[PDB]
Protein backbone atom coordinates (compact mmCIF):
# COMPACT_ATOMS: atom_id res chain seq x y z
CA UNK A 1 0.00 0.00 0.00
CA UNK A 2 1.27 3.71 -1.01
CA UNK A 3 -0.36 7.27 -0.71
CA UNK A 4 -1.04 8.16 -4.63
CA UNK A 5 0.46 11.64 -3.62
CA UNK A 6 3.43 12.86 -1.92
CA UNK A 7 3.46 13.97 2.06
CA UNK A 8 3.35 17.58 3.56
CA UNK A 9 6.02 18.15 5.68
CA UNK A 10 5.31 19.78 9.27
CA UNK A 11 8.19 22.27 9.82
CA UNK A 12 6.78 23.66 12.92
CA UNK A 13 4.65 23.36 16.15
CA UNK A 14 0.81 23.09 15.33
CA UNK A 15 -0.04 20.28 13.92
CA UNK A 16 -1.72 19.32 10.74
CA UNK A 17 -5.61 20.82 10.03
CA UNK A 18 -8.03 22.29 7.28
CA UNK A 19 -11.42 24.84 7.36
CA UNK A 20 -13.93 23.28 6.36
CA UNK A 21 -13.76 22.52 2.93
CA UNK A 22 -10.00 22.43 2.08
CA UNK A 23 -7.65 19.66 1.94
CA UNK A 24 -8.51 17.45 -0.26
CA UNK A 25 -5.30 16.96 -3.16
CA UNK A 26 -6.09 18.09 -6.27
CA UNK A 27 -6.44 15.07 -9.28
CA UNK A 28 -8.09 16.15 -11.83
CA UNK A 29 -8.92 12.52 -12.81
CA UNK A 30 -11.37 12.07 -10.27
CA UNK A 31 -14.94 12.81 -9.99
CA UNK A 32 -16.59 15.18 -7.29
CA UNK A 33 -18.58 12.25 -5.29
CA UNK A 34 -14.79 11.08 -5.10
CA UNK A 35 -13.36 14.14 -3.65
CA UNK A 36 -13.04 12.49 0.08
CA UNK A 37 -10.49 10.91 2.60
CA UNK A 38 -7.69 11.42 5.78
CA UNK A 39 -4.48 12.59 6.08
CA UNK A 40 -2.41 10.70 8.47
CA UNK A 41 0.72 11.34 9.87
CA UNK A 42 2.05 7.96 9.16
CA UNK A 43 4.92 5.54 9.79
CA UNK A 44 11.90 12.24 13.08
CA UNK A 45 9.50 15.02 11.70
CA UNK A 46 6.08 14.44 10.83
CA UNK A 47 4.83 14.30 7.72
CA UNK A 48 1.25 13.72 6.50
CA UNK A 49 0.19 11.46 3.72
CA UNK A 50 -3.43 11.63 1.89
CA UNK A 51 -5.05 8.64 1.53
CA UNK A 52 -8.69 8.64 0.06
CA UNK A 53 -12.39 7.05 2.45
CA UNK A 54 -12.18 3.84 2.83
CA UNK A 55 -8.37 3.04 1.18
CA UNK A 56 -5.01 2.96 3.44
CA UNK A 57 -4.07 1.96 6.09
CA UNK A 58 -6.96 2.97 8.19
CA UNK A 59 -9.69 2.17 5.43
CA UNK A 60 -12.26 0.95 7.82
CA UNK A 61 -12.03 4.27 9.59
CA UNK A 62 -15.35 6.10 9.21
CA UNK A 63 -15.47 9.66 8.61
CA UNK A 64 -15.27 11.42 11.55
CA UNK A 65 -14.05 9.22 13.72
CA UNK A 66 -11.70 10.77 15.80
CA UNK A 67 -8.32 8.85 16.51
CA UNK A 68 -4.82 11.05 16.02
CA UNK A 69 -2.53 11.85 13.40
CA UNK A 70 -5.62 11.47 11.49
CA UNK A 71 -8.13 14.27 10.29
CA UNK A 72 -10.70 14.56 8.13
CA UNK A 73 -10.92 16.25 4.49
CA UNK A 74 -13.95 16.95 2.50
CA UNK A 75 -14.70 18.69 -0.33
CA UNK A 76 -18.44 20.20 -0.85
CA UNK A 77 -20.18 17.51 -2.73
CA UNK A 78 -18.05 14.44 -2.29
CA UNK A 79 -19.72 11.38 -0.93
CA UNK A 80 -19.16 8.93 2.56
CA UNK A 81 -18.67 5.59 0.63
CA UNK A 82 -15.57 3.36 0.29
CA UNK A 83 -12.99 4.65 -2.89
CA UNK A 84 -12.80 0.73 -4.05
CA UNK A 85 -12.67 2.19 -7.80
CA UNK A 86 -9.71 4.32 -6.71
CA UNK A 87 -7.42 2.71 -4.37
CA UNK A 88 -4.41 3.33 -3.51
CA UNK A 89 -1.18 3.12 -5.29
CA UNK A 90 1.73 0.75 -5.72
CA UNK A 91 5.13 2.11 -5.75
CA UNK A 92 6.45 -0.20 -8.36
CA UNK A 93 4.10 0.16 -11.06
CA UNK A 94 3.41 4.22 -10.91
CA UNK A 95 4.75 7.01 -8.74
CA UNK A 96 3.42 9.31 -6.45
CA UNK A 97 2.06 12.70 -7.42
CA UNK A 98 3.61 15.50 -6.15
CA UNK A 99 0.40 16.49 -3.74
CA UNK A 100 -0.98 20.16 -4.62
CA UNK A 101 -4.01 22.14 -3.11
CA UNK A 102 -6.22 24.65 -4.90
CA UNK A 103 -5.23 28.02 -4.65
CA UNK A 104 -6.76 30.22 -1.82
CA UNK A 105 -6.61 26.99 0.41
CA UNK A 106 -4.74 28.04 4.15
CA UNK A 107 -1.79 25.80 5.29
CA UNK A 108 -0.84 26.09 8.85
CA UNK A 109 2.97 28.10 9.53
CA UNK A 110 5.74 25.66 8.63
CA UNK A 111 3.58 24.12 5.84
CA UNK A 112 4.37 24.30 2.07
CA UNK B 1 -23.02 18.53 7.54
CA UNK B 2 -21.53 17.81 10.45
CA UNK B 3 -21.67 17.01 14.07
CA UNK B 4 -23.91 19.63 15.82
CA UNK B 5 -27.09 20.41 17.77
CA UNK B 6 -30.41 21.55 15.16
CA UNK B 7 -32.99 21.95 17.12
CA UNK B 8 -32.39 22.85 20.91
CA UNK B 9 -35.45 22.90 23.92
CA UNK B 10 -35.12 23.28 27.56
CA UNK B 11 -36.02 19.47 27.88
CA UNK B 12 -34.71 18.04 25.01
CA UNK B 13 -32.01 18.45 21.73
CA UNK B 14 -31.88 17.33 18.28
CA UNK B 15 -28.52 16.20 17.43
CA UNK B 16 -27.27 15.29 13.71
CA UNK B 17 -23.93 13.99 12.10
CA UNK B 18 -23.36 12.93 8.34
CA UNK B 19 -25.06 10.06 7.19
CA UNK B 20 -22.91 6.65 6.33
CA UNK B 21 -24.93 3.49 4.91
CA UNK B 22 -21.54 1.42 4.87
CA UNK B 23 -19.84 0.93 7.34
CA UNK B 24 -21.35 1.70 11.11
CA UNK B 25 -23.70 -1.11 12.78
CA UNK B 26 -25.36 1.45 15.51
CA UNK B 27 -24.42 4.62 16.79
CA UNK B 28 -24.02 5.04 20.79
CA UNK B 29 -25.00 8.40 22.29
CA UNK B 30 -23.80 9.26 25.57
CA UNK B 31 -24.46 12.70 27.58
CA UNK B 32 -24.25 13.72 31.51
CA UNK B 33 -24.13 16.50 33.34
CA UNK B 34 -20.47 18.23 33.41
CA UNK B 35 -18.03 16.94 35.83
CA UNK B 36 -20.53 15.73 37.88
CA UNK B 37 -25.91 9.55 36.66
CA UNK B 38 -24.05 9.23 33.19
CA UNK B 39 -26.45 8.04 30.66
CA UNK B 40 -26.35 6.89 26.93
CA UNK B 41 -28.71 5.73 24.21
CA UNK B 42 -28.39 4.00 20.84
CA UNK B 43 -29.39 4.23 16.99
CA UNK B 44 -29.12 2.13 14.22
CA UNK B 45 -26.28 3.20 11.61
CA UNK B 46 -28.92 4.16 8.75
CA UNK B 47 -30.00 7.09 11.03
CA UNK B 48 -27.93 10.01 11.11
CA UNK B 49 -29.74 11.68 13.35
CA UNK B 50 -30.97 10.97 17.49
CA UNK B 51 -32.88 12.79 20.21
CA UNK B 52 -31.46 12.78 23.37
CA UNK B 53 -34.66 13.87 25.84
CA UNK B 54 -35.79 14.70 29.44
CA UNK B 55 -32.66 16.88 30.14
CA UNK B 56 -32.68 19.54 33.31
CA UNK B 57 -33.40 23.25 32.13
CA UNK B 58 -30.45 25.53 32.57
CA UNK B 59 -27.85 23.05 33.08
CA UNK B 60 -24.87 21.53 31.66
CA UNK B 61 -24.31 18.69 29.63
CA UNK B 62 -21.66 17.09 28.12
CA UNK B 63 -22.68 15.02 24.76
CA UNK B 64 -20.85 12.64 22.55
CA UNK B 65 -21.15 10.14 19.36
CA UNK B 66 -19.85 6.71 19.49
CA UNK B 67 -19.35 4.16 16.23
CA UNK B 68 -19.02 1.11 15.90
CA UNK B 69 -17.99 -0.49 12.61
CA UNK B 70 -18.67 -3.94 10.89
CA UNK B 71 -15.14 -5.03 11.81
CA UNK B 72 -16.62 -5.04 15.02
CA UNK B 73 -14.36 -1.33 16.36
CA UNK B 74 -15.78 1.11 18.34
CA UNK B 75 -14.90 5.36 17.37
CA UNK B 76 -16.44 8.24 18.85
CA UNK B 77 -17.80 10.66 16.03
CA UNK B 78 -16.10 14.03 16.86
CA UNK B 79 -16.87 15.39 20.58
CA UNK B 80 -19.39 18.58 21.33
CA UNK B 81 -19.73 21.25 23.99
CA UNK B 82 -22.97 21.69 25.24
CA UNK B 83 -23.61 24.52 28.37
CA UNK B 84 -27.37 26.25 29.14
Same mark, same amino acid.
Given at each position: ?77 ? !? ?18 ? !?? !?????? !? ?5 | ??? $? ?6 ? &? ?12 ? @? @?????? $? ?5 ? $? ?11 ? &? ?31
Amino acid at each position: TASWFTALTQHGKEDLKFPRGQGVPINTNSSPDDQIGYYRRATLSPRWYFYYLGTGPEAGLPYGANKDGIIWVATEGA !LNTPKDHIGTRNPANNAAIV !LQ !LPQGTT !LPKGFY | RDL $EVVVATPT &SLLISWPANYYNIR @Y @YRITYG $ETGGPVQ $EFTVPGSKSTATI &SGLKPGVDYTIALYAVTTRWRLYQMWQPISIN
